[PDB]
């Protein structure tokens, strides 16, 4: 099938571990610290991953950072969603950090994690493929609606290149459903909505000052 | 072209006036009261409009209301956006209520109205047509991601019928751009984001209790 899709597949990062501190008592603070620390390390990996997207590295450093600052949480959430597809009512933040309803309640994340589980439910019903997941991650980055873009035409070209990849993949692999590409694009509003819910919640956590956060995570959060 | 598109065009409601009270001094309260009153009357019209969407009235009354309660602000905002396409840095809430930057600041709506203006800017660049606007309004309704749907398969059918209409319209009218339908769908995340910003802001206004709101508007806001 489509070369861009194949390329994104081989550029897919290895999974990383959450490593919750086994000496620390379980608490909302522990859970939130673990998740923010995981997100910080995933962000480093995402920045490295983005250089493999055709045309992305040719953008100005400012536009690269604008896209990332707008899209980072959508990319993080798409990851948890994809890792969670073979599970039921649990979120696989990492192989060693799987959150069920009880844990979500303990962390103060019941509403957010239920929203993420709504995304999981929809992609389950659509039988989301890894090929589609990696392409949607790239599309979310290109389509992230930053207000600070310098070269708008180049960003549009990036959107178009990735959209074409999705269109082509679906036309070849899913002839039984001539509207599958569009159905995939129609999942992006819920991703955007859920990401905004997450950013707002963790921004509040940042303000309260009880959960330690690393530099990159804080930078993205404050952007 | 496509029959569903033609149908949605003839089902398009007439414009309504804002009628700000000429005896009341200008204030943030006046502006916000005017806008909420306008929105209340537009919601009545939207409910009437939705019965013309193929298949919508065959849904249970509960599912009809779930869709509307999720999508109402996206539909309102799409309306202001479309009315504003031939203007610059102004929002045409009604023929008699056009908001510029100064008015937005006075109303406490600078951030929200700038976000809406970002939608306007994007649709301007794409040369959004009335045909596309009415179809996107219907798609936003069907794709509104309510968590309370009874007949999920029927709602999916509704999404599919309207998506097919958009696909068919673009294939016939815009052969020069085989990705135009997808580009249109890719504007929906920003619509969702902007709508959520609006709902959250006016929910806060509701809590503060200084701006009078009518029953239907309050019901939608509280849903
Ligand atoms: C605040 C980030 C948190 C919600 C999170 C989301 C996704 C992920 O992969 C790691 C952490
Ligand atoms: C709170 C509703 C307000 C933002 C509004 C939005 C669109 C519209 O057509 C009328 C009012």
From Swiss-Prot, chains A, B:
Modified how: Acetylated by PCAF/KAT2 (in vitro).
Coiled coil (UniProt feature): none
Localization (cell): Nucleus
Tissue spec: Expressed in the heart, kidney, brain, lung, bone marrow, adrenal gland, trachea, spinal cord and thyroid gland.
Domain annotation NR LBD: ranges: 1-223
Biological role: Orphan receptor that acts as a transcription activator in the absence of bound ligand. Binds specifically to an estrogen response element and activates reporter genes controlled by estrogen response elements. Induces the expression of PERM1 in the skeletal muscle.
Family: Belongs to the nuclear hormone receptor family. NR3 subfamily.
Additional facts recorded: No physiological activating ligand is known for this orphan receptor, but 4-hydroxytamoxifen and diethylstilbestrol act as inverse agonists and deactivate ESRRG.
Oligomeric form and interacting partners: Homodimer. Binds TLE1, PNRC1 and PNRC2. Binds GRIP1. Interacts with NRIP1, NCOA1 and NCOR2.
Protein name listed in UniProt: Estrogen-related receptor gamma
Taxonomic path: Eukaryota, Metazoa, Chordata, Craniata, Vertebrata
Interval of the full protein contained in this chain: 234 to 456 of 458
